[PDB]
Design a protein around this ligand. Structure first.
Ligand SMILES: CC1=C(C(=O)O)[C@@H]2CC(C)(C)c3c(C)c(C)cc4c3N2[C@@]12C(=O)NC(=O)N=C2N4C[C@H](O)[C@H](O)[C@H](O)COP(=O)(O)O
Ligand SMILES: CC1=C(C(=O)O)[C@@H]2CC(C)(C)c3c(C)c(C)cc4c3N2[C@@]12C(=O)NC(=O)N=C2N4C[C@H](O)[C@H](O)[C@H](O)COP(=O)(O)O
Ligand SMILES: [K+]
Ligand SMILES: [K+]
Ligand SMILES: [K+]
Ligand SMILES: [K+]
Ligand SMILES: [Mn+2]
Ligand SMILES: [Mn+2]
Lengths: 500, 500
């Protein structure tokens, strides 16, 4: 099975890429696995595969950390993400995001039901498992529970059957047969949960599949539109119908090659303590426990020698930055274009802790609009901040065509030098806010509202007659022939490889 | 003579440090020298010494580029600045800024007059030189003149004789015996010029000394207080009285070992075209010429084999960032402390194009003040933005004690995650603005007023009961013994030097 369609194959691909360290000595799921993974993520090292996890029994489970984190070299920086998608390991961010958007004007390719798959190699009923007895990791020392779920996909379906959503949302072990987790607006798991609650008749049929096809976990992390079944989107993106098997205890369908599957229900009535957790913005607030959604597990099925993927999230750089930020930015780019805004590119700078998105503007198109900064900022902010794809993003930075938004140094340069604080900005207080940002949920204002801004780093003539400067840099401040001469004589003179 | 007291010795020190490339083949002052220097600055390479400058005649002149720029290694990143000050090459920024502040509560050590020095080895009178015939560099392709003056020190004295100021301000060749340059409020050269203009009797006696003692050029770049003679400040900082020689044609005094000295007058009546220039924020606006101050040169004196230092300024990283930003930040730190504000450290992040200063707060002291963000932001902004030391700085970022303000990644993290846009900020429109920032002079609002902000990245409990989070990082999210175990086993497991 190809790497993008089968997690086990993906692990092999990371090995073959010399992007994996197999650790075959005993490693403690209580902090040690996550500490190693955290160090990996902070240093862009090889992904760790913990084959000898203390507490592993009857095949449950090995751990792969850092599945979507960065590689050290520039040339294959995003290679792990490329390996989720059948792209060359040298693929650019633009190419990765274009691949993730490609299915947006394609017909869905619905999944194919098959009678069995590797995820059915082992099972444990309601009398055979205990979630507290599995080697579930404690990821950060102050976490309020052992977070089994950092890189699996929740599967829930609308009551009417017409939409099946796949998404990543955290969850931790509550007791032998329950999890608690985040289920918050405007997320699709929340939207579907609300439908079931308003119907009022039953708990939500649910499955949580770990070690799913990599292409599927990428879509699970992306805010594709309301009502769109991720499986068909992934089918279209990959050009292949995904093979799914029915759950044993409900009529949901899971990827055939899933490493581990939990089957059960998401309660429409019950809650339990959830969090705190060391989160994407780099913080944990110890003791901040709150009631979360409560999941009941009825059955576990799993592959022989099952592998659980894990995100040891926090400070830069991990899946919560590479995937949440970049994939939100991708959807925002498309949303802007669909609203007739002249946006060519979007990226969430890592430097902003993926709380900003930089929007590259086609300034020829902007000039033809014959508009102003005030007007344009308002229009862009209304489009983005009123939409779910803008949920996690609190600052939009508009930049002209000279800026590569995938290069944080250049975004910061433009922001710092082209956007006059206050005057060149529009604040948005009457929009949904992202409470997990510390300045929101632990800040001075409403946790769930406001705190958003559009910062216009377009210069005045970019709206009128065209850019009126040159950069004071090597590239722009010297003629071509001179630059080439300098380059050609550089080592000869005495001054100081692409792959590395 | 020590390196910090004699530019020629400083050049030797850079050689000995393996931080110099001598280029002994012909190099064109028309763009080529500056292009090489620009490349050096963008890549943190060795400083270039152009010993064979096309147009050099009768000893005028060689060029040293990048005198205060960065070295590639982390361990001696700021070594060129350390070499200006007799500090070890491994000195931290904190140590460099403390050295630059040390003279602020010391008695001045006034200079010593000596009868001659190396700067008198050669001379050219009013009938022997022509500034248009010297190998003055064209630094950026669109510059409005050949900028002879990027790293010399202007010397002007108050009419009453009581204050002699040393400062860096740019100047370009106007004709055979005149320069034009920037002389703008609130700078000390401008303040002194105004005194002479109000007296109305004569042009300002002036000298411009190039290749001065390194310790002197550092003070020349620092906003030490009004009325304070830089020579005595440098004397106190270095513990040594600086040796000065009288000019031939006026009664000003120049460093004995100056490489090149221009003597003349700064007009109280005449102006001439000045600029545009590729400036510190990374831009040039071609054709933006404006009237500047006009200097008449009456005499040149110089060392045998004189060396002209040059800053090829623009995009990161050069003297305009390392010196302007850091030294303003130093003075701001002191100013805040003198105003009873609990600031421990200040730095202008390079990422902000040195337009921000991050202020590290002693939050134990803050808590004892029993204040609020609104109140504290206003107080800090009033102190800084109403003072000359705040002139160049448009955003102040307040951070708590966990943040190392000398580390831009950490400042950006704190800014992005702890300061709610709008609500946690105070805008200042009725303060002097820095027009050279593009969003000021080429922006949507008044070039000279406003556009400043205090951004509070202190979290709420930092004002009350104390920090209430731990970072979700390797350092803070795992116990000591586990961290050390991970580190000790890191290479054994299969994962990846301080000097490099
Ligand atoms: C914000 C999130 C997390 C957190 O920071 O704690 C937490 C951490 C983990 C689990 C590691 C994590 C990883 C590793 C990745 C890659 C993404 C997320 C998360 N977690 C959170 C969460 O628990 N709640 C949430 O609101 N969305 C999260 N996403 C992002 C969502 O997947 C994304 O917004 C999708 O678009 C949602 O799908 P649809 O609803 O559009 O179908
Ligand atoms: C802003 C400046 C420049 C510019 O960007 O064009 C220009 C570029 C050069 C010459 C390379 C340059 C270098 C290489 C360095 C290291 C510093 C400066 C400059 N230039 C400018 C300038 O021409 N006008 C100005 O307002 N101040 C400048 N400084 C900073 C001042 O020296 C500083 O503010 C001092 O505090 C002033 O001394 P006092 O008045 O307090 O005594
Ligand atoms: K999704
Ligand atoms: K702007
Ligand atoms: K000065
Ligand atoms: K704050
Ligand atoms: Mn969805
Ligand atoms: Mn001064």
């Amino acid at each position: 099975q190809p790497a993008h369609l089968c997690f086990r194959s993906f692990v092999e691909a990371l090995k073959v890429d010399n992007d994996l360290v197999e650790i075959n000595t005993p490693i403690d799921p209580n902090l040690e696995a996550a500490a190693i993974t955290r160090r990996v993520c902070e240093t862009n090292d090889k992904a760790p595969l913990f084959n000898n996890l203390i507490g592993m029994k009857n095949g449950l489970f090995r751990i792969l950390g850092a599945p979507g984190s960065l590689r050290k070299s520039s040339a294959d920086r995003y290679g792990r993400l490329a390996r989720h998608l059948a792209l060359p390991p040298t693929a650019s961010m633009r190419e990765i995001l274009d691949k993730m958007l490609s299915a947006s004007d394609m017909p869905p390719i619905p999944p194919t039901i098959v009678p069995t798959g590797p995820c059915k190699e082992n099972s444990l009923d309601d009398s055979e498992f205990d979630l507290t007895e599995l080697p579930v990791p404690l990821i950060h020392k102050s976490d309020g529970g052992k977070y089994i779920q950092t890189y699996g996909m929740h599967i829930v379906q609308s009551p009417d059957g017409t939409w099946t959503n796949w998404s990543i949302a955290r969850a931790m072990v509550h007791d032998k047969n329950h999890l608690t987790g985040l289920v918050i607006p405007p997320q699709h798991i929340w939207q579907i949960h609300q439908m079931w609650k308003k119907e009022g008749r039953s708990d939500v049929p649910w499955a949580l599949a770990f070690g799913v096809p990599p292409a599927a976990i990428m879509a699970s992390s992306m805010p594709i539109p309301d009502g769109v079944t991720e499986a068909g989107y992934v089918g279209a993106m990959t050009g292949s119908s995904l093979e799914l098997v029915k759950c044993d205890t409900n009529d949901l369908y899971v990827p055939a090659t899933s490493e581990i599957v939990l089957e059960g229900t998401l309660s429409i009535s019950e809650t339990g303590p959830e969090g705190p957790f060391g989160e994407m913005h780099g913080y944990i607030f110890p003791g901040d426990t709150h009631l979360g959604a409560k999941y009941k597990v009825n059955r576990i099925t799993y592959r022989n020698n099952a592998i659980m993927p894990m995100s040891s999230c926090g400070r830069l750089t991990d899946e919560t930055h590479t995937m949440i930020g970049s994939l939100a930015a991708a959807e925002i780019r498309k949303l802007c274009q669909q609203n007739d805004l002249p946006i060519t590119d979007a990226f969430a700078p890592f430097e902003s802790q993926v709380t900003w998105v930089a929007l590259r503007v086609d300034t020829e198109k902007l000039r033809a609009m014959k508009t102003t900064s005030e007007g344009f900022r308002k229009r862009v902010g209304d489009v983005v901040f009123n939409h779910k794809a803008g949920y996690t993003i609190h600052r939009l930075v508009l930049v002209g065509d000279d800026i590569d938004v995938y290069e944080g140094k250049d975004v910061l340069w433009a922001f710092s030098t082209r956007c006059r604080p206050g005057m060149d900005e529009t604040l948005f207080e009457d929009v949904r806010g992202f409470p997990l940002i510390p300045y929101m949920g632990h800040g001075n204002g409403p946790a769930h509202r406001g705190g958003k801004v559009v910062s216009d780093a377009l210069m005045p003539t970019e709206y009128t007659t065209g850019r009126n400067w040159e950069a004071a840099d090597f590239n722009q401040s010297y003629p071509e022939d001179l630059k080439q001469k300098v380059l050609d004589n550089w080592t000869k003179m005495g001054f100081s490889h692409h792959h590395h």
